[PDB]
């Protein structure tokens, strides 16, 4: 309850500078699980307009509108593009109520008065109360605007939903001694409770409306044109298409390399092979596997998980250091004798991600981590299980694999270790599209974490529904 009140006052004190109106939300088991509710660290929200443009960026356009680079030296913009993305998200206050409750009884047991149009109870295993701001860029609010909600957890993992302002305001705008603001806020109470879905109808959350909000006083205008909603839908379409266009880029690359080579696949992975085998049925199984990979590829494909560490801020500088290191001049005798010893080069083992596609019972594994190293005798690759065990799927006739190396080289491997090899091309995606869709979250400091970086943080914060809360 107090988070809504404080956030209302906070958005009022900031309204002239920001023009963000305070939207009060409640989340339950329809949007997040109990562990995610108890261990939630941050909530972040983003405003994008009827043209797909975030309100943290330049109002007319950005240098991120140019296509990506494919260079590790550039890393799709480097630190500046990362900073332009981080500036686009804004942080929201939130409180978790981790034990089962019924919402209206909770509000009445607090100071509030509730006078809903129909007294329908809603019951919820846990509740997260948070306030997001949707930006009326003037005293005018459009229905084609969408708002993004981000929930983040201590390991840095995040979950994004997005819903457009028309869903939120479908009803609310379509109808449009001395006292303390706290007492009249409680006395005036709540009279609305509306259920809103995100655009893709994945998650439901409830919006809570108060009659004491400064929202009521402003008498600003709202509108939804058809063409604006059409353009907003097109921008949304471009948003969600970003991983699938990369998947199709890899698919077209595989077919293009296969046409270029003439179907001759050289061995790149170690596996003892026999001549006296029906290699043609292996080619047929390769066809079925390459169809099935397109059937089941997803956002959690190896290609997205390979590009994601490239978008991190350190990536460009580290790539330039590596470029300098590999092309360093051979040391003179003086340096070897008197000077410092040379930097150790890249470790013999690399970390990769793979998509393992088995045909016999159609199944595709996507976010698979493997360790790769070249065996000394022949420079082929040995792919090992991240517990150090040799991966056996090279020996199974009914499985093909697509690996993507950390430098965005991809292999597509058949039984026997004969592979198609090429590079993932990012040029079909604007730098902003990739960069905003897949940039990793970087944490701001909070309760229970070291001021110094790199420290082993102590017991992570939690709000417990199973235990009597400590103070």
């Amino acid at each position: 309850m107090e988070t809504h009140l404080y956030s209302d006052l906070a958005f009022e004190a900031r309204f002239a500078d920001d023009e963000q109106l305070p939207l009060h939300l409640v989340l339950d088991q329809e949007v997040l699980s109990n562990e995610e509710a108890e261990t939630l660290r941050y909530v972040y929200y983003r405003n994008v307009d009827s043209a797909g443009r975030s309100t943290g960026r330049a109002p007319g356009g950005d240098e991120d509108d140019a296509p990506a680079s494919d260079d590790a030296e550039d890393a799709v913009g480097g630190d500046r593009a990362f900073d332009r993305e981080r500036r686009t998200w804004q942080r929201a206050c939130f409180r978790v109520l981790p034990r089962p409750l019924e919402l209206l009884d909770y509000l009445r047991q607090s100071g509030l008065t509730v006078t809903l149009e129909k007294e329908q109870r809603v019951r919820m295993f846990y509740a997260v109360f948070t306030t997001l701001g949707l930006r009326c860029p003037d005293n005018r609010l459009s229905g084609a605007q969408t708002l993004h909600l981000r929930l983040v957890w201590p390991d840095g993992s995040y979950r994004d939903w997005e819903f457009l302002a028309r869903d939120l305001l479908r009803e609310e705008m379509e109808a449009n001694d001395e006292v303390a603001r706290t007492d009249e806020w409680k006395g005036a109470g709540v009279s609305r409770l509306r259920e809103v879905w995100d655009v893709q109808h994945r998650v439901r959350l409830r919006v809570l409306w108060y009659v004491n909000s400064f929202w009521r006083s402003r008498e600003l205008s709202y509108d939804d044109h058809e063409v604006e909603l059409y353009r907003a839908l097109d921008a949304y379409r471009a948003r969600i298409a970003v991983e699938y266009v990369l998947i199709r880029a890899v698919r077209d690359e595989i077919y293009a390399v296969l046409r270029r080579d003439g179907g001759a696949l050289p061995q790149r992975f170690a596996c003892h092979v026999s001549r006296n085998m029906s290699w043609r049925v292996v080619w047929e199984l390769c066809r079925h596997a390459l169809a099935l990979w397109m059937d089941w590829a997803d956002v959690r494909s190896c290609i997205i998980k390979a590009l994601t560490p490239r978008l991190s801020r350190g990536a460009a500088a580290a790539a330039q250091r590596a470029r300098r290191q590999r092309e360093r001049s051979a040391p003179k005798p003086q340096e070897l004798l008197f000077g410092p010893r040379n930097e150790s080069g890249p470790p013999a083992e690399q970390t990769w991600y793979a998509d393992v596609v088995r045909c016999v019972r159609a199944q595709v594994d996507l976010g698979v981590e493997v360790r790769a190293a070249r065996c000394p005798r022949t420079g082929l690759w040995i792919v090992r299980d991240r517990r150090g065990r040799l991966r056996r799927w090279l020996s199974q006739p009914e499985v093909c694999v697509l690996y993507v190396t950390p430098d965005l080289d991809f292999y597509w491997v058949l039984p026997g270790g004969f592979a198609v090899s090429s590079r993932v091309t990012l040029h079909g995606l604007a730098q902003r599209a990739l960069r905003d869709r897949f940039q990793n979250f970087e944490a701001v400091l909070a309760r229970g974490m070291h001021v110094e970086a790199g420290r082993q943080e102590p017991e992570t914060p939690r709000v417990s529904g199973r235990r009597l809360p400590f103070d």
Partner: protein, 288 residues
């Protein structure tokens, strides 16, 4: 625990007779020695014409406080009391003590019958005053210091004349004005600017830190603090910053309030529970 004081100057019948009237009074000395010279006796060594009351109040804090307990000859014997034991002390300040008062030491403001002068040097002893009178004298001096830039107006002249006058049980006296020749002494000036600077820095920084801490736990106290800030800004409405500069503002706030610790705090030195009828002397329990 006796400290010997010797006079580098020719004593006389009237000097020793004047000094023997003080045979229980509180005399502060700069640091603990076994044999000191009379120059270190009293507050005279610290007096100058540029710093004044606040500087003395700071200096008097970390002197060692002592009771006079004999004059054997050309030498004076001083006894340094220990915490908790009961001692006989002379009242020579501007007021009278009742049973159970908490007594404070202030630099003196009035000064004839006491004054032992020899060779441009004279024995100057602090005021032993009950705690409420010390607090009120202090606040009155500070407010007179803040009125120091607008003495051009007749109402402020009257207000300073009202601040100068203090009445306390069966006594009445005027606190001297910290403004001499239209100008405020250096230490009172820096005390006043420290108070004003801490006020301004608080008013500038509080909103940002309220937001930052409310992002962690939005307790009701933070709600009321934010409401109070918004009200303050409405009152001001009648008419981004770098990390280095934020750290500079925070550090400046804290170093400015370190300047005030002498003024804001007030040590109790003696607790009085036995009084002579004369009100000339009382026996007190020592706090140190």
């Amino acid at each position: 625990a006796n400290i010997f004081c010797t006079f580098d100057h020719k004593l006389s019948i009237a000097d020793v007779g004047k000094l023997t009237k003080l045979v229980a009074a509180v005399v502060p000395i700069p640091q603990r020695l076994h044999l000191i010279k009379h120059y270190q006796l009293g507050l005279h060594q610290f007096v100058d014409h540029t710093r004044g009351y606040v500087r003395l109040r700071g200096l008097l804090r970390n002197m060692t406080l002592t009771l006079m307990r004999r004059v054997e000859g050309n030498q004076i014997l001083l006894h340094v009391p220990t915490h908790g034991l009961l001692y006989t002390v002379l009242n020579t300040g501007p007021v009278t003590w009742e049973k159970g008062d908490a007594l404070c030491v202030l630099p003196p403001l009035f000064h004839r019958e006491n004054l032992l002068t020899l060779g441009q040097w004279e024995l100057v002893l602090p005021w032993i005053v009950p705690m409420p009178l010390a607090l009120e004298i202090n606040q009155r001096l500070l407010i007179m210091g803040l009125f120091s830039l607008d003495r051009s107006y007749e109402e402020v002249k009257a207000a300073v004349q009202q601040l100068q006058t203090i009445t306390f049980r069966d006594a009445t006296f005027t606190i001297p004005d910290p403004v001499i020749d239209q100008h405020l002494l250096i230490d009172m000036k820096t005390a006043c600017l420290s108070m004003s600077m801490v006020a301004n820095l608080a008013s500038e920084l509080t909103m940002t830190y309220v937001r930052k801490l409310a992002l962690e736990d939005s307790s009701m106290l933070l709600v009321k603090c934010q409401e109070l800030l918004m009200r303050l800004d409405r009152e001001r409405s009648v008419g981004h910053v770098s990390p280095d500069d934020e750290i500079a503002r925070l550090s400046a706030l804290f170093v400015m309030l370190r300047q005030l610790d002498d003024l804001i705090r007030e040590q109790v030195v003696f607790t009085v529970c036995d009084v002579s009828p004369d009100n000339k002397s009382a026996t007190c329990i020592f706090k140190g």
